[PDB]
């Protein structure tokens, strides 16, 4: 193949706003000035599959209307949605469907053999179509779903070779097709001496000048060269003599050195999630998990997680932070009693069985256990405290069983009338509603102190390259 230079071509209208005698700075997807576009020439056939990254600037030095359509798609094998645009002689057929394209689709509908169901079809009559040569520039973009197509027709006087003209041509918006199917590749459709200059778009900032009629006369790329930045940073197409500050030369990083500690043993998250039935509420099992590699991802397959709320940290991004010492507190509660396990919320369990501090920085996770911790007999093997004198202190376990006094009579340990027992049992029946079903709840409390961290996620540590500007990703410092 060959390559040509884009002499400041591919500047369409960013929005649908009319402006005159202004200098507008837009930040849309355009074609960079003086770029290296492809020069696929067809005399020999040339119709290869080209990637669709962000946008396509398809030029056409065309005679007798050789190129007559386009095909966009991801797989192009009748397994994913694909867009087909044809223009035979009189109209443009634009349809997104599930066609089966052959190895070399060309134009007598030979480009496909099967036609599945479609949900969109446009026959917008206007066909988008011998002294001078024809130049048919088309900008195809897929932003916010709607497939935008900009078109521009130009009479070009053929020079010595076949080189893109050196001039400005503002492309006019054509359609606003309601699309959004994934599109990553495309191909052209010819009809059996022409050539196209398909290019690729990328984000950039352009300074556009509007005349008194509202048509863009020229453009500045604000990133092509030193002077262009000076013109943009000064909002003027003509800069005077002097020195101007435009930007800052910041050296970009090279790599992403991690340098995490030397920890290989897997985290004991299996004996606290796939253990025996469970522990009780007033005797929640607390275990210190130190010197481990906490892979929370495995916690999503060994046990289906319901609403996951983390206080102080985000639910994700837990594999790149290394805590010092974590504590797992496991117990079982009712369905409606899961709201009380939270900093600030009160109730029956939040003040008598398990209280979280107001500055709790950790993750609580509860999941229904109506399949393993239930049976049709009356589930009375889980106890909880209902009566106590004062509220439970944050992170404190009450193992005592002193009798409760609800009146003024000196019971002195009789456990009868007005001397209700402080510990009662639940009732987990498989026929009750979801509000009364048992839920296993584990609270992972983290600690971030000035100490060598010993529990992080599964991130492979890299080598230490010095004397180079790199991205450091230490235990708690990025």
């Amino acid at each position, epitope marked *: 193949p060959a390559y040509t230079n884009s002499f400041t071509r591919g500047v369409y209208y960013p929005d649908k706003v009319f402006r005159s005698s202004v200098l507008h700075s837009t930040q849309d997807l355009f074609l960079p000035f003086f770029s290296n576009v492809t020069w696929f020439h067809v005399i020999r056939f040339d119709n290869p599959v080209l990637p669709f990254n962000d946008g396509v600037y398809f030029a056409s030095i065309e005679k007798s209307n050789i190129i007559r359509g386009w095909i966009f798609g991801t797989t192009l094998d009748s397994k994913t949605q694909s867009l087909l645009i044809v223009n035979n002689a009189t109209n443009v057929v634009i349809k997104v469907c599930e066609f089966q394209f052959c190895n070399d689709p060309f134009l007598e509908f030979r480009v496909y053999s099967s036609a599945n169901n479609c949900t969109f079809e446009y026959v917008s009559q206007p066909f988008l179509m011998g002294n001078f040569k024809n130049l048919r520039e088309f900008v195809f973009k897929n932003i916010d779903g709607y497939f935008k197509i900009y078109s521009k027709h130009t009479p070009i006087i053929v020079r010595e070779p076949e080189d893109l003209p050196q001039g400005f041509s503002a492309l006019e918006p054509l359609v606003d097709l309601p699309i959004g199917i994934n599109i990553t590749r495309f191909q052209t459709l010819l009809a059996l001496a022409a050539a196209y200059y398909v290019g690729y778009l990328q984000p950039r900032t352009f300074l556009l000048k509007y005349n008194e009629n509202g048509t863009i006369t020229d453009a500045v790329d604000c990133a092509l060269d030193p002077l262009s930045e000076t013109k943009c940073t000064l909002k003027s197409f003509t800069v005077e003599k002097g020195i101007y500050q435009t930007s800052n030369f910041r050296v970009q990083p090279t790599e992403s050195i991690v340098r995490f500690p030397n920890i290989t043993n897997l985290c004991p998250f299996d004996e*606290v999630f796939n253990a025996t039935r469970f522990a009780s509420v007033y005797a929640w099992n607390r275990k210190r998990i130190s010197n481990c590699v906490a892979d929370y991802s495995v916690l999503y397959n060994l046990a289906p997680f319901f609403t996951f709320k983390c206080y102080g940290v985000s639910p994700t991004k837990l594999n790149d932070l290394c805590f010092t010492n974590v504590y797992a507190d496991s117990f079982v509660i009712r369905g409606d009693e899961v709201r009380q396990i939270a900093p600030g919320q009160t109730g029956n369990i939040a003040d008598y069985n398990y209280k979280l501090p107001d500055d709790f920085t950790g993750c609580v996770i509860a999941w229904n256990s109506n399949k393993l911790d239930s049976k049709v007999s009356g589930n009375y093997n889980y106890l909880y405290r209902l009566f106590r004198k004062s509220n439970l202190k944050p992170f404190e376990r009450d193992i005592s069983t002193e009798i409760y006094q609800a009146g003024n009579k000196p019971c002195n340990g009789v456990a009868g009338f007005n001397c209700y027992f402080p510990l009662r049992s639940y009732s987990f029946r498989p026929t009750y509603g979801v509000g009364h079903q048992p839920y296993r709840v584990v609270v992972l409390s983290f600690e971030l102190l000035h100490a060598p961290a010993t529990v992080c996620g599964p991130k492979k540590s890299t080598n230490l390259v010095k004397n180079k500007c790199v991205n450091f990703n230490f235990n708690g410092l990025k």
Partner: nanobody
Amino acid sequence: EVQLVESGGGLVQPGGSLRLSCAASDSSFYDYEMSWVRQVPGKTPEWIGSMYPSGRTYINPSLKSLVTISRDNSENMLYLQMNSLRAEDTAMYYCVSNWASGSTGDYWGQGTLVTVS
């Protein structure tokens, strides 16, 4: 070190009073929880009764007024007296120490069969 040996298991006709006892090891097993649990074949374990260190014994609400837990010996023994035996009492009985807070520190000792026919 923990070799809790259960005794009393046998064949009792429906209506009798079976007195099980788990003799513990000569150590400081007191001042902690002590629980009983049945192991009917083909089902999850079911709690029977507790032996809280204070002295207050809590019984399963389902098996109320049917079984009792007594420890008025103070030396090494714990007794479980079950009255009015029924057909569903044919199970493997166990006497564990660290219950209601286990799954990583529970010590299930020995266990004997109890058949009522």
